[PDB]
């Protein structure tokens, strides 16, 4: 049959495979092959021309709606972004991930495995010149252009996936299409960016199948919140999608489907949902009286006509009009011979009765070029929110205009300091009176922010300075300002001695100074090391931040300074391996860094937990050593939650102090072995140099500067 | 709280995971380290005094039996190459994957947290002199060597795993010390190395928990032989391993145990089944949940255990643990032994249902009779024994190091002859493919017998492979799936061409048919590349000899015959798991990823080396000719799929609009386009831009399989 995981006989063991994912990249690629150069190669507008093509060439396989393929291919790249959560970065479109399980048999995803296919010739036609990721959003882009609307851009960049990403979770619920994350609607459980397992955003239906439209409301402006859009682009964004196309729901889908590709046979060849006798989601009609132009026959439709809902021929809840007066307005999909009547959603129902949604619907209404720059512009963020700063976006056909959502940044005006330049400042840093310590952790306060799933965060930018970073708790505010306003004053007098056009931003002294520090510490324990420094990190401005937007990027678990906010829900370990793998690193790669950083010694309100040795500020092993001293025994701390003391097992001396972060390392059967490792006799200049790798490795991360 | 796993939703979802193992080395082992030179930097006779001194150094956090360590070290060995599987060569101490889950919490494991711990000065001392594997193994042999009894020899070479192994199903039972794998003793599944989920090989009380011994030795006797050992070395393993120690059971494990370790606290660092008394209080000491020791000097070797077991008549009882276990029915022997802890209070041995088997049954029987009557072959078979048990996952004797292996090899390494000969240089290599590719042999017959020969490596056991050509010995030649009348005329094609080479030679060269069978093969791969229009030079290296019947245990081969062959499109109708899971189970054994599973096989289908020379999968119209047809053709949606009406593995590919039969396949074809990860792979591969890369990745795994066993090399 097949061997039962660990995870299955102890369903609490730390999650340490989404930590392995950064150990290797599956699939057949090469190490060094460079995509952003091969999509260099990729001559968009040839591409886009066989898209536009596919459009109207219907395949036998999956007929074309109305003769055109463009709304599918709209809601397939709609859903491959629609999946992206605020809260972790996580989902999105970047890696095509819509591709592989659980994503693509969830049930919003059905019939989007024929989109797909649809696709596979083109891809086949031009290989690694564009990813599938980069494809199903140029499909979308060229769907809405051939049916009459301009894009505001289109960028390429995104790599494909060869898997899925362990590291999200979906949710509490053991069964699609089921709900145990919300109460009330816009209650939804925090981390979350759908209300339903196994759907895009929310239930078409309404909130737990109840066609009640100023509750869908609430739970439609929570989720496209937690997807980072307000009031105007959630009404653009909708409204706009839903003037094209049509839904599915000839019959019901529980009777009439055959099972979800992961579930479907061999023969069927990745594709699921078979019809036994189309149906998708159960749901039918079109919303307008021409599917495949663009026009404002879906606010039209829904404010200048009063509807009712009812149950349709899928058996599911959708509105139909009061009146006659649209009766058998628009053409079948299908039969030439045949007409429907047009028909709305609860959701789209909650954009009229809902008050504030409503106002924003009477404005599109009244100017068609308002709800039509909303729409493009929020397409293309829709569409582009994972891919970071505007540095990663590829292509003839990247806009001028930076957006604040790309978290732009501005350009360093000045020659960059050279290799004198660099030393002599270290020197000055490390002369002031700012401790190892303090550099260590304000250079790591400012390179932690970032997080792989959608490339945000980072010390590029110095935003550690700006509002919220500069007040988070974490960051201790008052030790904070002490550490830049003694950098600053370091960038201000180095600016003002120099005469050649040179200049250095506070950014890269921060992280020149964190690596002076931790150069020091390992000095201090008789290593010669030399850190690899890179300078380019510009200043940036608040001008350059929406800062309630960075406030996604506040962390409630810092492994490296022993922070763990007292709210947490989920063990702190775990939050701590959640953490790592945003930075992209391997379980070795965070036992180096957690244990070698306990020897230097940053933590949050400078407590001594975890810092198990005699001699702070010291890179050494001394962490491991301790920590696997069967002399000790460790036990929890009265009156806490994540505190231990670690009790001489003889003399019963209190030796130490530590949180569940620092003991998760002796404890994991994983990763005592990689402690062991380290708390051997001749591995300390190991430690040494897997740390250094791994602070290097964190403080460039989000160097897209210099690839 | 955590993510749910595709296997969750979808239970019989592709366990591709095992292939993914492959693709890296999780832990912080650099990629250029080399475990074999730096053991060999070891002073072993250092680590030994230290073993040594560590068996009577008793740490109060768990107090030493008698004074002496030795016999739960003796266990603690025994148990990490307890797990071995003849099977698919899985399981073993070579990994030293005791120390991870789900290993590492079995309930037959328990306490043994507790004795690894013990060694972790010792290891980290070390370093990365010696590895775990290594030292558990070594801890075994100090403790029997320190308590009277000199064993036969010891290996190193072990490098350790930092997880588990994946691929390893370890039973259908949902929950440890139940099993569902039996119904009448001596009946276990096939494939399955113990009588019950969670155990080593069976149930010390007896079957189903029942106190038969006659019932017991079915299944011991089972148990055993799927772990390579035969009665004489049965009975002398348990016979001498029991001839140390006790059981502990001073109450019942089931409300006296803590949680195992991968479910105890997080202060308990790893550690597990804390006992409520305290692990500080070795009377109190739980384990197995059975009490009392086998013999009076359970820290001395000597005949106590089979004397003890056949000159006394024993009884069932309850133990104070609440489990079967034996007594004497006189008081001969009643408080014969001192008490492990209580230096006032004496003890009386007892045995388990699983020794009273050895009793009872007659065969076991014979055998600890003459035991008993001849102690020199008693030690003699158990010394060989211990070593064989201890060894038997660490492949041929090319990979043993250290001065304490034996110059004798044994049998069951399945030893190679030395070549008596000038290797073939640069110019004989070119030479002979081009003869070979002269001869009246078809490119798909080299690769086919190439393959057979080749594919028998499993990385578990690091058993099979190329070298020695044991693919023209009993059994391989006779092995259904080598066709062997095929196979016959292949072989002496090559032959042939072996014996004119050989004659030919002034100097001191000659060529092994071995390196022959490979070189064939490789010849053939870069003709079929040519043939498409590409120029490679598959990377070839000698030395390979022909091994005789006398280096071959033609039974144990048996353990090395395929149910399934993806490269062969060969499926024996028998098998009860969908083949594309027994295709990726095979994978996974010759070390490869899902991407170089993909080349291989979708390459090979444009060469077309088909069992029985059908076009299963085959989707080209241009046969020996490495393209990547396979993929184009079998992405192409102008072709739907469907199962073959009265067939049992076959499926139809046929013309979406004509309805034609275009192609037809297996399970093993089409998972390549069923499969999410998979096709995403082929999706790769069957791109305009990508044959060139599909005939290079294809050379890559050819040759990587072609090499897996060449460990004379490393
Ligand atoms: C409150 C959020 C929304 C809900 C609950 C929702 C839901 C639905 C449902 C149930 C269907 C029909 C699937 C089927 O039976 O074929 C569909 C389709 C469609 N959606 Fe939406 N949607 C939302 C937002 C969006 C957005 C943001 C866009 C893109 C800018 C878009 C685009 C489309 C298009 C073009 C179709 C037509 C597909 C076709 O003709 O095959 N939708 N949606
Ligand atoms: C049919 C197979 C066997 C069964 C069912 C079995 C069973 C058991 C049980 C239940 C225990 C006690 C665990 C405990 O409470 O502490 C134990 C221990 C022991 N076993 Fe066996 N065993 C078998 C074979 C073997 C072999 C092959 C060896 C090694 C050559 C070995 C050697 C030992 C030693 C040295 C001890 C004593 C541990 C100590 O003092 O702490 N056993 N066994
Ligand atoms: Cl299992
Ligand atoms: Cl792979
Ligand atoms: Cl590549
Ligand atoms: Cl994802
Ligand atoms: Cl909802
Ligand atoms: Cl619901
Ligand atoms: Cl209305
Ligand atoms: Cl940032
Ligand atoms: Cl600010
Ligand atoms: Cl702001
Ligand atoms: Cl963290
Ligand atoms: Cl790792
Ligand atoms: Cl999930
Ligand atoms: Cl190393
Ligand atoms: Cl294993
Ligand atoms: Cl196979």
């Given at each position: 049959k097949r061997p039962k995981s660990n995870q299955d006989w102890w369903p609490s063991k730390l999650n340490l495979e989404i930590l392995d994912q950064n150990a290797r990249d599956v699939g057949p690629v090469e190490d060094d092959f460079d995509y952003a150069e091969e999509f260099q190669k990729l001559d968009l507008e040839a591409v886009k021309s066989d898209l536009e093509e596919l459009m109207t060439s219907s395949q036998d396989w999956w007929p074309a709606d109305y003769g055109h393929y463009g709304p599918l291919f709209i809601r397939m790249a709609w859903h491959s972004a629609g999946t992206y959560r605020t809260a972790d970065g996580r989902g999105g479109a970047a890696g095509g991930r819509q591709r592989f399980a659980p994503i693509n048999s969830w049930p919003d995803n059905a019939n989007l495995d024929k989109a797909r296919r649809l696709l596979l010739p083109i891809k086949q036609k031009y290989g690694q010149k564009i990813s599938w990721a980069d494809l199903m959003i140029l499909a979308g882009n060229v769907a809405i252009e051939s049916m009459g609307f301009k894009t505001f851009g289109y960028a390429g960049g995104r790599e494909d996936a060869f898997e899925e990403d362990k590291a999200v979770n979906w949710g509490p619920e053991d069964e699609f299409e089921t709900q145990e994350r919300f109460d009330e609607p816009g209650e939804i459980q925090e981390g979350l960016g759908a209300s339903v397992m196994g759907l895009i955003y929310v239930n078409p239906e309404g909130p737990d199948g109840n066609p009640d439209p100023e509750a869908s409301a609430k739970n439609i402006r929570q989720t496209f919140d937690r997807m980072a859009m307000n009031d105007k682009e959630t009404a653009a964004l909708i409204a706009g999608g839903h003037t094209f196309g049509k839904v599915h729901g000839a019959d019901d889908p529980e009777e009439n489907l055959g099972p979800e590709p992961e579930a479907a046979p061999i023969e069927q060849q990745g594709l699921g949902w078979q019809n036994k006798n189309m149906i998708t989601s159960g749901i039918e009609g079109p919303w307008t009286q021409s599917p495949t132009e663009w026009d404002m026959g879906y606010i039209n439709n829904l404010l200048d006509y009063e509807w009712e809902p009812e149950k349709g021929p899928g058996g599911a809840w959708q509105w139909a009009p009061k009146?006659?007066?649209?009766?058998?307005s628009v053409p079948d999909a299908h039969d030439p011979d045949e007409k429907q009547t047009p028909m709305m959603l609860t959701t789209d129902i909650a954009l009229k009765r809902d008050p504030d949604y409503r106002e924003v619907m009477e404005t599109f209404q009244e100017n068609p070029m308002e709800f039509g720059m909303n729409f493009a512009k929020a397409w293309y963020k829709l569409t582009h929110?994972?891919?970071?700063?505007?540095?990663r976006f590829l292509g003839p056909e990247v806009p001028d205009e930076e957006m604040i959502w790309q978290d732009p940044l501005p350009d360093a005006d000045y020659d960059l300091i050279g290799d004198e330049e660099i030393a002599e400042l270290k020197e000055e840093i490390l002369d002031s009176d700012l401790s190892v310590s303090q550099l260590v952790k304000t250079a790591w306060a400012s390179a932690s922010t970032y997080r792989d799933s959608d490339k945000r965060g980072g010390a590029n930018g110095a935003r550690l300075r700006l509002e919220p970073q500069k007040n988070w708790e974490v960051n201790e505010p008052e030790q904070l300002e002490t550490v830049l306003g003694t950098l600053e004053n370091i960038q201000t007098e180095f600016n003002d001695s120099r005469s050649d056009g040179t200049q250095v931003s506070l950014a890269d002294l921060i992280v020149l100074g964190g690596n002076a520090a931790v150069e020091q510490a390992a000095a201090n324990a008789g290593y010669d090391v030399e850190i690899p420094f890179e300078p380019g990190r510009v200043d940036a401005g608040p001008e350059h931040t929406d800062a309630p937007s960075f406030?996604?990027?506040?962390?409630?678990?810092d492994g490296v300074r022993n922070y763990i906010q007292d709210d947490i829900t989920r063990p702190a370990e775990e939050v701590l391996v959640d953490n790592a793998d945003l930075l992209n690193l391997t379980a070795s790669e965070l036992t180096a860094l957690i244990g070698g950083m306990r020897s230097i010694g940053a933590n949050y309100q400078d407590t001594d937990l975890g810092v198990f040795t005699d001699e702070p500020e010291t890179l050494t092993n001394d962490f491991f050593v301790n920590l696997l001293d069967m002399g000790t025994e460790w036990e929890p701390a009265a009156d806490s939650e994540h505190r231990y003391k670690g009790l001489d097992?003889?003399?019963?001396?209190?030796?130490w102090e530590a949180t569940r972060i620092d003991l998760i390392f002796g404890s994991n059967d994983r990763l005592r072995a990689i402690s062991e490792v380290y708390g051997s006799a001749d591995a300390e200049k190991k430690l040494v140099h897997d740390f250094v790798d791994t602070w290097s490795k964190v403080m460039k991360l989000d160097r897209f500067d210099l690839e």
């Amino acid at each position: 049959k097949r061997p039962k995981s660990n995870q299955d006989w102890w369903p609490s063991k730390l999650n340490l495979e989404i930590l392995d994912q950064n150990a290797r990249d599956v699939g057949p690629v090469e190490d060094d092959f460079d995509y952003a150069e091969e999509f260099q190669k990729l001559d968009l507008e040839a591409v886009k021309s066989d898209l536009e093509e596919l459009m109207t060439s219907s395949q036998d396989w999956w007929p074309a709606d109305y003769g055109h393929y463009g709304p599918l291919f709209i809601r397939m790249a709609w859903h491959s972004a629609g999946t992206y959560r605020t809260a972790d970065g996580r989902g999105g479109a970047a890696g095509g991930r819509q591709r592989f399980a659980p994503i693509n048999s969830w049930p919003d995803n059905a019939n989007l495995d024929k989109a797909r296919r649809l696709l596979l010739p083109i891809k086949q036609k031009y290989g690694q010149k564009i990813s599938w990721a980069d494809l199903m959003i140029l499909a979308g882009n060229v769907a809405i252009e051939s049916m009459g609307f301009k894009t505001f851009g289109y960028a390429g960049g995104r790599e494909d996936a060869f898997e899925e990403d362990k590291a999200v979770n979906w949710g509490p619920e053991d069964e699609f299409e089921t709900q145990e994350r919300f109460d009330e609607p816009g209650e939804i459980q925090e981390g979350l960016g759908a209300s339903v397992m196994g759907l895009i955003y929310v239930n078409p239906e309404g909130p737990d199948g109840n066609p009640d439209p100023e509750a869908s409301a609430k739970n439609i402006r929570q989720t496209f919140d937690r997807m980072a859009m307000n009031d105007k682009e959630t009404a653009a964004l909708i409204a706009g999608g839903h003037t094209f196309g049509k839904v599915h729901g000839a019959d019901d889908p529980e009777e009439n489907l055959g099972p979800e590709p992961e579930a479907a046979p061999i023969e069927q060849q990745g594709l699921g949902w078979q019809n036994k006798n189309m149906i998708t989601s159960g749901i039918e009609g079109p919303w307008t009286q021409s599917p495949t132009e663009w026009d404002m026959g879906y606010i039209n439709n829904l404010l200048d006509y009063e509807w009712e809902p009812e149950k349709g021929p899928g058996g599911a809840w959708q509105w139909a009009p009061k009146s006659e007066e649209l009766k058998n307005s628009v053409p079948d999909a299908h039969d030439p011979d045949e007409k429907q009547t047009p028909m709305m959603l609860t959701t789209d129902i909650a954009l009229k009765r809902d008050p504030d949604y409503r106002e924003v619907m009477e404005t599109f209404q009244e100017n068609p070029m308002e709800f039509g720059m909303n729409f493009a512009k929020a397409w293309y963020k829709l569409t582009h929110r994972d891919m970071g700063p505007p540095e990663r976006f590829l292509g003839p056909e990247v806009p001028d205009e930076e957006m604040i959502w790309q978290d732009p940044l501005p350009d360093a005006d000045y020659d960059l300091i050279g290799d004198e330049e660099i030393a002599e400042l270290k020197e000055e840093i490390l002369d002031s009176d700012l401790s190892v310590s303090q550099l260590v952790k304000t250079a790591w306060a400012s390179a932690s922010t970032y997080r792989d799933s959608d490339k945000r965060g980072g010390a590029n930018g110095a935003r550690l300075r700006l509002e919220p970073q500069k007040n988070w708790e974490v960051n201790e505010p008052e030790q904070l300002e002490t550490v830049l306003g003694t950098l600053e004053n370091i960038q201000t007098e180095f600016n003002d001695s120099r005469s050649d056009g040179t200049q250095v931003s506070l950014a890269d002294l921060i992280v020149l100074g964190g690596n002076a520090a931790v150069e020091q510490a390992a000095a201090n324990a008789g290593y010669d090391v030399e850190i690899p420094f890179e300078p380019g990190r510009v200043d940036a401005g608040p001008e350059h931040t929406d800062a309630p937007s960075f406030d996604a990027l506040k962390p409630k678990v810092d492994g490296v300074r022993n922070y763990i906010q007292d709210d947490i829900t989920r063990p702190a370990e775990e939050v701590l391996v959640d953490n790592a793998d945003l930075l992209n690193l391997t379980a070795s790669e965070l036992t180096a860094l957690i244990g070698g950083m306990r020897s230097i010694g940053a933590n949050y309100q400078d407590t001594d937990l975890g810092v198990f040795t005699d001699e702070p500020e010291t890179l050494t092993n001394d962490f491991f050593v301790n920590l696997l001293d069967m002399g000790t025994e460790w036990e929890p701390a009265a009156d806490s939650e994540h505190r231990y003391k670690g009790l001489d097992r003889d003399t019963g001396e209190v030796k130490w102090e530590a949180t569940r972060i620092d003991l998760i390392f002796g404890s994991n059967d994983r990763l005592r072995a990689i402690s062991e490792v380290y708390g051997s006799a001749d591995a300390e200049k190991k430690l040494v140099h897997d740390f250094v790798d791994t602070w290097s490795k964190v403080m460039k991360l989000d160097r897209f500067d210099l690839e």
